[PDB]
């Protein structure tokens, strides 16, 4: 499937607006969403893989896309690490799979949140890319209470094509990111 709000909203609203602020010669010079990497860090699931495969289907479900099992490298003896036993699911969203995700995130996930007041404005990594963390994971749509075994949220990395911060900063604002300012 390839057709919905954020896609259009970006092309038939965000796309031109941006051009009014910075005025790009060429079409591609325009900032552009194109990558969203969700990633939990359940080092706790190191032992019991029960929680492992479960959060894996929770994750793959909220995103619709298949989940990848991240592996370890060095060794945090200070918390039971060696080669690659541990895990931390990671899915990478692009094209429409991404859009459809951002649809729920902006209209459902972000909305119902234990005291929401805005996203951190400083969270821009100095290059057209934003990062945010979620505590609860049931704040996503199809996650009923009788389904959650425990609070195991994650963090999302959103990638753009913009160089400067405030340049991409606007890009997410126009899309629907409620920055705390």
């Amino acid at each position: 499937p390839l057709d919905l709000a954020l896609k259009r909203k970006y092309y038939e609203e965000v796309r031109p607006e941006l051009i009014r602020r910075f005025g790009y010669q060429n079409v591609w010079e325009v900032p552009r969403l194109e990558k969203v990497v969700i990633n939990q860090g359940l080092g706790e699931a190191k032992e019991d893989a029960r929680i492992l495969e479960k959060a894996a289907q929770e994750l793959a479900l909220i995103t619709g896309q298949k989940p990848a099992v991240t592996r370890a490298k060095k060794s945090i003896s200070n918390f039971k690490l060696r080669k690659g036993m541990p895990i931390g699911l990671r899915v990478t969203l692009r094209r429409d799979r991404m859009w459809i995700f951002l649809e729920k995130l902006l209209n459902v996930a972000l909305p119902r949140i234990r005291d929401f007041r805005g996203l951190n404005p400083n969270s821009f990594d100095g290059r057209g890319n934003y990062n945010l963390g979620l505590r609860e994971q049931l704040i996503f749509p199809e996650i009923t209470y009788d389904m959650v075994d425990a609070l195991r949220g994650m963090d999302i990395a959103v990638v753009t094509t913009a160089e400067t911060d405030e340049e991409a900063r606007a890009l997410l604002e126009l899309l629907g990111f409620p920055f705390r300012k």
Partner: peptide, 30 residues
């Protein structure tokens, strides 16, 4: 796959996701 995001606060969003069963108590409009 369609989806009925019937927000409790009047709003009734609609997008794409597995199973059309959705009933957000309060979404982006409250």
């Amino acid at each position: 796959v369609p989806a009925r995001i019937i927000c409790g606060c009047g709003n009734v969003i609609e997008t794409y996701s597995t199973k059309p069963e959705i009933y957000v108590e309060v979404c982006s409009k409250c």
